[PDB]
Write an enzyme that holds these catalytic residues in place. Structure first.
Site, PDB file in Angstrom:
ATOM      1  N   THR A   1       6.699   2.438 -38.714  1.00 37.22           N
ATOM      2  CA  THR A   1       6.752   2.752 -40.139  1.00 37.22           C
ATOM      3  C   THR A   1       7.649   1.795 -40.913  1.00 37.22           C
ATOM      4  OG1 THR A   1       8.418   4.410 -39.566  1.00 37.22           O
ATOM      5  CG2 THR A   1       6.154   5.171 -39.889  1.00 37.22           C
TER       6      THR A   1
ATOM      7  N   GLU B   1       0.187   4.704 -22.454  1.00 36.61           N
ATOM      8  CA  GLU B   1       1.008   5.881 -22.190  1.00 36.61           C
ATOM      9  C   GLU B   1       0.880   6.319 -20.737  1.00 36.61           C
ATOM     10  OE1 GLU B   1       0.895  10.388 -23.839  1.00 36.61           O
ATOM     11  OE2 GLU B   1       1.561   8.883 -25.289  1.00 36.61           O
TER      12      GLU B   1
ATOM     13  N   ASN C   1       9.034  11.956 -25.816  1.00 42.86           N
ATOM     14  CA  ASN C   1       9.402  11.486 -27.142  1.00 42.86           C
ATOM     15  C   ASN C   1       9.280  12.633 -28.130  1.00 42.86           C
ATOM     16  OD1 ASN C   1      10.179   9.934 -29.283  1.00 42.86           O
ATOM     17  ND2 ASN C   1       8.440   8.521 -29.217  1.00 42.86           N
TER      18      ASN C   1
ATOM     19  N   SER D   1       6.288  11.944 -31.599  1.00 45.19           N
ATOM     20  CA  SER D   1       5.157  11.101 -31.249  1.00 45.19           C
ATOM     21  C   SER D   1       4.038  11.277 -32.266  1.00 45.19           C
ATOM     22  CB  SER D   1       4.648  11.442 -29.853  1.00 45.19           C
ATOM     23  OG  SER D   1       3.636  10.537 -29.453  1.00 45.19           O
ATOM     24  N   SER D   2       3.315  10.192 -32.533  1.00 47.55           N
ATOM     25  CA  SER D   2       2.162  10.244 -33.420  1.00 47.55           C
ATOM     26  C   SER D   2       0.872  10.253 -32.618  1.00 47.55           C
ATOM     27  CB  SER D   2       2.164   9.060 -34.385  1.00 47.55           C
ATOM     28  OG  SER D   2       3.345   9.041 -35.167  1.00 47.55           O
TER      29      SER D   2
END
Ligand SMILES: [Mg+2]
Lengths: 184, 747
Positions: free
Chosen positions: B160, B430, B202, B205-206
């Site tokens: 971001t 991942e 995390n 996470s997105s």
């Protein structure tokens, strides 16, 4: 993908549609009507013979023949008219495009499958074909892998035992009681 | 060989993935004497060699491909030194930009630097995000063809922040007044509240790909962004592994249960609901969900979603939660019923404005219809639970697409968009201790993106080779299509999963058996875990990954019984719920087939375009400013594909040198006879003597191309000549000077 046709000739009813649908596009009686009287009017647009819902509608004028009895196809020139009507008029699809799946009662004459195959490749020019035992399909429908299936339409009744997807051919019973003999 | 005395070497070490060592005695064709930093000799053994080290001049260069030995420890060293001692957070690899997240604010983002990059060419500068943005911004003007910046990594890495500054750059070099920066930034809290999750490894996470298209007019004044979203992980809504959560918005909503306007939602605590209690981890330490809620509502109001729609959204999410508690009783092996006056369904119908008896009927039955006739058929408790959870996943996915359409309405501008620049933010590769369908999807998406990246790099290399007039046949193409065909093609691991979802009494065990039967010995990339029959291994691009079969099938499955939608569409209590379902096989499609199609939409979006790539890496797990854990950073670099990218680059001609700078560097090795007036012929002569195998280099029109390793060889032989000369001269000066001291003593 090109979906395959499913065409359950049965007897008395034709059930047809595309694979992956949950109910058939086409349910009409497997009946061929020919007119027996003298046609008197002129310019009427007379038509040689009627298939299915037409022969049902006009039945008072017609003689109605079932081409399949006791799960055996007994007149191929009728039956091929019924398939022709199924593909071209009722489903409105050219069968040369994509495969077709056909269903048969067990233990019926060996030549019936050979004729069905020969007609499907030669005249209808289907790219690929298969024939499947009806009572096996009733388990796929009822969501099971172990069953005994009393499958009884017009024409024929049979029992097939299936255990975990192994069929037991020695135990297959076939019986010729059916809706047509209850009707007679 | 050239393992000589005072050769440096890297040696593997448990504590910091590699340590430097120095080869204390020459190698000759079993064990090496190695001098270590910790102790003058500790000894290393050679097996049925240690990775050699680049020369000191090369280390610290702006571009990791400038190295002559390309391998994990030299990359890790260059990134570590540039980050720690020079505080340069940006580095180049091939085309890629690697951004090392400093966890500290920096002056480097100022408007003077924005001007300094504007109008430059790419190589003219030390790497910075503005130099990628500028390369895109120039190519968009030079050609019709559209441009993308692709940002990959973990969500913590700070993608971001990269997108923020890339937009600030576009705004400033466009000279635009408009107002897109504020709105795009103010959209982030809602998109994070709906679309964003706490994973085992995390927090925040997105779980979707977000694509922001910055639109430009025919004059390259800014026009305001269009937001798209892809790859949403719908299955998370109804299932969580140990100490996961689902999307934050449910916990923000549950935390707000005390607020007056949420009285009628009859909320509980976050472990009261079946769709949130499963992870056993209701609270993230360091976050007040009760306050992130307020920041979400502020972000809504800044995007001008009315308070009525905001209460519709939270009413629907309370709907989904109360729906999940509805608990069917099995009447029979082939039928089920909801018990009398069941309270979750009562509160759900009160929320959604539907007749209790219709929902209670349709949840437990489904309708078949042929054109002539229709049958109402009961369904098992298993199918009833699968239907409820498919309806909840469908309500959620539609609510998500609706919030994103109102975002787009607030971000659009009326001016006709002439062209755009897209910023794609997506998760990296991942891998976890326990590894599941969510990761299998993520890794499939990353396989597709890495194929696109290899396409692009290979194409630009064929262009550069034809620029330098070098035969194309020398560049080998590395292709991961045999791995994608293992997953997406017919009889692939996805195809046999969809085929197992609808075969009768299908199960994860018999799915695994179908996998083994189809692939086990037939494919180079599929493997079975030695000690189990309920897992499988795919040799992905970045690593081997072992996926465990337990509970894919329940995650894989969607079928929404259309009559449940047709009940909900009939609601008349509030506006939003009919609005959601405005525009079938779409209901029949499984989750995996939806994901495969969303990924095809993504790839057909990016293939219309010219990519530019960014990679973000997280240097340390504790957010310490400007500290760099080698053990974490190596893993991040592997996960981002940077290492397999570098392995592919090292197969080629990595090292490219201009004739005049080569001549400048290596005249030390060149006899004053042999330098001609013609630089190209001079260098052809010198190099053809110095490196006898001509296969190590090509003489392009403008540059020498070297294979990996040979520039280090030339630097070594240069250093050896310079050392022998210096020893000879200085020993002669020593003997002169002491000869004069002898004359002093005679005097
Ligand atoms: Mg039948």
């Amino acid at each position: 993908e090109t979906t395959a046709l499913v065409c359950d000739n049965g007897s008395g009813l034709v059930k047809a549609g595309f694979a992956g649908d949950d109910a058939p596009r086409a349910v009409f009686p497997s009946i061929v009507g020919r007119p027996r009287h003298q046609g008197v009017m002129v310019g009427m647009g007379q038509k040689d013979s009627y298939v299915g819902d037409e022969a049902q509608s006009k039945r008072g004028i017609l003689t109605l023949k079932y081409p399949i009895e006791h799960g055996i196809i007994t007149n191929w020139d009728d039956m091929e008219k019924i398939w022709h009507h199924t593909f071209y008029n009722e489903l409105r699809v050219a069968p040369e495009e994509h495969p077709t799946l056909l269903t048969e009662a067990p233990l019926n004459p060996k030549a019936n499958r050979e004729k069905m195959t020969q007609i499907m490749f030669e005249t209808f020019n289907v790219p690929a074909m298969y024939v499947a035992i009806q009572a096996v399909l009733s388990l796929y429908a009822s969501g099971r892998t172990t069953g005994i299936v009393l499958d009884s339409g017009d024409g024929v009744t049979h029992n097939v035992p299936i255990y975990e997807g192994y069929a037991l051919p020695h135990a297959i019973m076939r019986l010729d009681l059916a809706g047509r003999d209850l009707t007679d | 060989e050239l393992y000589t005395k005072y050769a440096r070497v890297w040696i593997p070490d448990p504590e910091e993935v590699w340590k430097s060592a120095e080869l204390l005695k020459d190698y000759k064709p079993k064990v090496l004497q190695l001098r270590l930093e910790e102790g003058k000799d500790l000894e290393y053994c050679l097996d049925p060699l240690p990775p050699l080290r680049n020369p000191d001049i090369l280390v610290g260069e702006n571009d990791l491909t400038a190295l002559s030995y390309l391998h994990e420890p030299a990359v890790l060293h260059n990134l570590k030194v540039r980050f720690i001692d020079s505080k340069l957070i940006y580095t180049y690899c091939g085309i890629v930009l690697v951004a090392i997240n400093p966890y500290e604010q920096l002056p480097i983002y100022g408007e003077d630097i924005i001007n300094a990059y504007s109008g430059q060419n790419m190589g003219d500068m030390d790497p910075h995000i503005f130099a990628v943005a500028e390369e895109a911004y120039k190519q968009m003007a030079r050609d019709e063809r559209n441009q993308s910046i692709i940002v990959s990594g973990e969500s913590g890495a700070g993608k971001t922040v990269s997108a923020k500054y890339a937009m600030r750059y576009f705004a400033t070099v466009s000279g635009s007044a408009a107002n897109v920066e504020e709105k795009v930034l103010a959209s982030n809290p809602i998109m994070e509240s709906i679309g964003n999750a706490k994973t085992t490894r995390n927090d925040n996470s997105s779980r979707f790909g977000k694509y922001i298209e910055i639109g430009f007019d025919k004059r390259y004044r800014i026009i305001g962004a269009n937001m798209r979203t892809y790859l949403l992980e719908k299955s998370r809504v109804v299932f969580q592994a140990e100490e996961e959560r689902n999307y934050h918005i449910f916990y923000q909503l549950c935390a707000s249960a005390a607020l007056p306007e949420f009285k009628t939602l009859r909320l509980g605590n976050a472990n009261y609901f079946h769709y949130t209690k499963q992870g056993g981890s209701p609270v993230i330490d360091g976050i007040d969900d009760a306050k992130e809620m307020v920041n979400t509502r502020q972000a809504c109001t800044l995007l001008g979603i009315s308070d009525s729609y905001q209460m519709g959204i939270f009413r629907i999410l309370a709907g989904i939660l109360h729906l999940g508690n509805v608990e069917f009783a099995s009447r029979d092996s082939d039928s089920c019923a909801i018990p009398p006056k069941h309270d979750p369904l009562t509160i759900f119908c009160d929320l959604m404005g539907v007749d209790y008896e219709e929902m209670a009927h349709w949840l437990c039955h489904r309708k078949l219809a042929t054109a002539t006739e229709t049958y109402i058929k009961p369904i098992s408790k298993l199918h009833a639970i699968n239907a409820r959870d498919a309806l909840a996943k469908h309500i959620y996915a539609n609510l998500f697409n609706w919030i994103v359409d109102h975002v787009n309405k607030a971000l659009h501008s009326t001016v006709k968009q002439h062209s755009f620049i897209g910023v794609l933010d997506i998760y990296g590769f991942e891998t976890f201790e326990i590894n599941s369908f969510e990761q299998f999807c993520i890794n499939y998406a990353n396989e597709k993106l890495q194929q696109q990246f290899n396409m692009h790099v290979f194409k630009l290399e064929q262009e550069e080779y034809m620029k330098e007039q070098i035969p194309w046949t020398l560049i080998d193409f590395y292709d991961n299509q045999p791995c994608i065909n293992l997953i997406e093609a017919k009889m692939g691991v996805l195809d046999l999963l969809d085929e197992e979802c609808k075969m009768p009494k299908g199960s994860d065990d018999t799915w695994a058996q179908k996998l083994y039967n189809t692939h086990l010995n037939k494919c180079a990339l599929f493997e079975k875990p030695r000690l189990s029959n309920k897992a499988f291994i795919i040799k992905h691009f970045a690593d081997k990954v072992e996926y465990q079969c337990e509970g894919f099938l329940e995650k894989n499955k969607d079928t929404v019984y259309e009559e449940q939608i047709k009940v909900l569409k009939s609601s008349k209590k509030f506006k939003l719920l009919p609005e959601l379902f405005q525009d079938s096989k779409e209901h029949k499609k499984t989750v995996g087939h939806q994901f495969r199609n969303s990924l095809h939409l993504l790839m057909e979006t990016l293939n219309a375009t010219t990519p530019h790539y960014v990679r973000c890496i997280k240097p340390n797990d504790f957010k310490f400013p400007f500290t760099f854990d080698e053990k974490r950073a190596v893993q991040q670099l592997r996960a981002c594909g940077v290492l397999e990218t570098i392995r592919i680059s090292a197969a080629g001609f990595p090292s490219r040198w201009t004739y005049q700078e080569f001549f400048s560097r290596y005249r030390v090795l060149m006899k004053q006879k042999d330098v001609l007036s013609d630089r190209k012929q001079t260098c052809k002569n010198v190099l053809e003597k110095l490196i006898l195998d001509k296969d190590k280099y090509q003489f392009g029109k403008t540059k020498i191309f070297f294979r990996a390793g040979q520039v280090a060889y030339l630097e070594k032989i240069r250093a050896d000549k310079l050392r022998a000369a210096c020893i000879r001269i200085q020993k002669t000066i020593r003997g002169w000077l002491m000869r004069k001291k002898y004359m002093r003593m005679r005097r």
